[PDB]
Amino acid sequence: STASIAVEAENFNAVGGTFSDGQAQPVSVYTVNGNTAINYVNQGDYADYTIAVAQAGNYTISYQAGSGVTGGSIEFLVNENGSWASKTVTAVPNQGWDNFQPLNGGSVYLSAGTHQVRLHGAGSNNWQWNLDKFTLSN
Ligand SMILES: OC[C@H]1O[C@@H](O)[C@H](O)[C@H](O[C@@H]2O[C@H]3CO[C@@H]([C@@H]2O)[C@@H]3O[C@@H]2O[C@H](CO)[C@H](O)[C@H](O[C@@H]3O[C@H]4CO[C@@H]([C@@H]3O)[C@@H]4O[C@@H]3O[C@H](CO)[C@H](O)[C@H](O[C@@H]4O[C@H]5CO[C@@H]([C@@H]4O)[C@@H]5O)[C@H]3O)[C@H]2O)[C@H]1O
Ligand SMILES: [Ca+2]
Numbered sequence: 792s793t794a795s796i797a798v799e800a801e802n803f804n805a806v807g808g809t810f811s812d813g814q815a816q817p818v819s820v821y822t823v824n825g826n827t828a829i830n831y832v833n834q835g836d837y838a839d840y841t842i843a844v845a846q847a848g849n850y851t852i853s854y855q856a857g858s859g860v861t862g863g864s865i866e867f868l869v870n871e872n873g874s875w876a877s878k879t880v881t882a883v884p885n886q887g888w889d890n891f892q893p894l895n896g897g898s899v900y901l902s903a904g905t906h907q908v909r910l911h912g913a914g915s916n917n918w919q920w921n922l923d924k925f926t927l928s929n
């Protein structure tokens with residue numbers, strides 16, 4: 792029942808958000824030290840991903856995330872029949888914008904099938920976090 796699904800944060804299907812950050816898109820892509828990541832993530836911004844899951848299970852979520860402020864949090868949601876369902880919310884340690892560190896994001900039950908997942912800038916700060924990737928492990 793072991794399984795591992797790595798998702799590159801830059802590989803979102805769509806991004807969204809109201810915060811006026813002056814960029815072409817509400818969330819942007821950059822590279823640092825060979826790591827391609829999303830940045831300019833503000834409060835209320837989000838990134839959507841479509842994920843195929845062959846093996847049903849209670850997956851553990853790990854993020855390769857950094858932040859340069861206090862009050863950034865990653866909320867992981869799944870779109871369940873046209874309504875977003877909040878799964879976990881994880882504060883991101885303030886250890887530097889480009890300093891990605893493994894971050895435990897809790898667990899989420901995923902059935903065998905295809906899931907729309909959203910990562911949302913849920914924290915209190917105007918500025919939230921940068922993200923290299925996340926992994927779902929069973
Ligand atoms: O004698 C007094 C008077 O003197 C006059 O000469 C002055 O004009 C003065 O006026 C004051 O001046 C300052 C002090 O009080 C206010 C007053 O007007 C004024 O305060 C400043 O106001 C600015 C707007 O005009 C700003 O708000 C400024 O705050 C800063 O603005 C920028 C720069 O540093 C940050 C700070 O908030 C902010 O930058 C953003 O910071 C984020 C972290 O908080 C983050 O780094 C953002 O960048 C992102 O970082 C990572 C995630 O995504 C990317 C992205 O680049 C990257 O990977 C960053 O943009 C405020 O101090 C008279 O009183
Ligand atoms: Ca933004």
Ligand SMILES: [Ca+2]
Nearest residue numbers: 799800827923
């Ligand atoms: Ca990446």
Ligand SMILES: [Cl-]
Nearest residue numbers: 797798799802
């Ligand atoms: Cl990917």
Ligand SMILES: [Cl-]
Nearest residue numbers: 878879880897
């Ligand atoms: Cl939680």
Ligand SMILES: [Cl-]
Nearest residue numbers: 878898899900
């Ligand atoms: Cl769950």
